[PDB]
Structures are given as structure tokens and as C-alpha cells.
Amino acid sequence: QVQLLESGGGLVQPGRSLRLSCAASGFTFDDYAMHWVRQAPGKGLEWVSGVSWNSGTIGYADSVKGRFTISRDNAKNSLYLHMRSLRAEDTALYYCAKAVEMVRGLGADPEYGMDVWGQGTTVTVSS
């Protein structure tokens, strides 16, 4: 069965780094564009980043641009999210979701449809 397991949470002081990891198990990992979506505490969702089928990133959120860095690995079926310049306003859950339409299955390539969601971690920042 399809499984999306994420890890990397834990309290870290402001002005450091973290490296979240999402591992997928149960499908051909190279025919699905992954996404990383935050979830502020007691608030609405907020898109953070993504990655297409060919390891080509699709841009980050406007307010986060400058620090976050996404990376993928089809060989180990692993997607990673390096985080820099951590600030107090970056405390939230983080889910890694997968697209729906397999590539070249029908104009352009697909990126919508975050259907399967893992249980996110609980990254927090404080001093």
C-alpha cells in the first residue's frame, strides 16, 4: 500500500538549519510530482514547494523564497527539504503530497491533485 513517511521534526533555535525527509513506498516514484505543504498551528494550509517528475523544481512560496531548498532522489525514492534562516514564524506541520496524473497520460505536464498525504511532523522554533 502507498506510504509517505516524513521525519526531521524537533525544536531548533532561530537561525539554524533543518533537513526534512519524505520517503515514498508503493508506487513508481518517477511518475509523480511531489509537493511539500505546510500547515500553520490552528490555521489554514499554505503551499511551500514542489518538484516535478524530472527533478525540476517548480518554485517556492512568495514569502519563503530565499532560504528553502528542495531536492529529490528517484534512486532511493527520497525527497528532501533543506531549510535555512529558520525564524519563529516557521513553526507548523509539514505534509508531503503526491500528484494524481501520471506523466504523458493526458497539453502540458500535470502538477495538480495532491491526493495522498502522509502524517506530517511537528517542526517548531523557539528560544
Binding site: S52, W53, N54, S55, G56, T57, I58, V103, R104, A108, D109
Partner: protein, 49 residues
């Protein structure tokens, strides 16, 4: 020429090879259906770093 002589005696001789010649060439192979997924590589919307 075959007898290696200029005087040839009465009789029947077998000399050379009659062999009809081919006309053209023919190559056969079934409908080509498998195709390498190259377009997805060159025509991808976003390349990696």
C-alpha cells in the same frame, strides 16, 4: 574457349552457367510499436539543476 582449342569436333558440349539475376531488394519487419520515451527528456517543462 572451354575446350582450349580452335577446331571443335561434332558433338554436344556443356559450357557455362545460366543463372537469372535478382531485380531489387526486400526488407521486412513488423509494425514498429515500441518507442523510446525521449520526448519526455528533451521536451520536459523543467530540467533539474
Amino acid at each position: 574457349c572451354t575446350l582450349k582449342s580452335f577446331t571443335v569436333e561434332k558433338g554436344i558440349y556443356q559450357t557455362s552457367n545460366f543463372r537469372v539475376q535478382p531485380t531489387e531488394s526486400i526488407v521486412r519487419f513488423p509494425n514498429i510499436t515500441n518507442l523510446c520515451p525521449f520526448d519526455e527528456v528533451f521536451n520536459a517543462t523543467r530540467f533539474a539543476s
